[PDB]
Amino acid sequence: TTISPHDAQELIARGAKLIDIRDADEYLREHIPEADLAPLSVLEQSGLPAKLRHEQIIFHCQAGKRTSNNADKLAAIAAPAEIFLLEDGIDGWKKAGLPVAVNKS
């Protein structure tokens, strides 16, 4: 259920939702352009909204830690989708040479 950045790309090309579970300030500083923001605490409170649902959902955070440690929560939050966790988070995505959007001041 953990997915490489390259394999996540292939899924996104087929309509998979990429969900960034970090906070807005983190997202605004640097994010994956395809990603939809939905902070974990919001998802825990009010659930995954219909607009972010799809047959395949990939979650990511900073370095893979928050996704790994909240795997069970995320499995329920996105049920009954096919659910994936991005290996090493946005840091992994960056290490793989894939594009990010960085705030210019």
- The 10 Å Cβ neighbour count of residue 6 is 12
Sign of CA dihedral 17, 31, 64, 3: positive
Q: Tokens 């290490």 label which residue?
A: 95
d(CA 68, CA 70): 6
d(CA 85, CA 68): 8
Q: Tokens 């953990």 label which residue?
A: 2
Domains and CATH numbers, the chain: 1-105 (3.40.250.10)
Give this entry's resolution in angstroms.
1.6
Strand pairing class (17-20; 56-60): parallel
Answer yes or no: 61 catalytic.
yes
Three-state SS at 17: strand
Q: Which of 19, 38, 40, 61 is catalytic?
A: 61
- The 10 Å Cβ neighbour count of residue 33 is 9
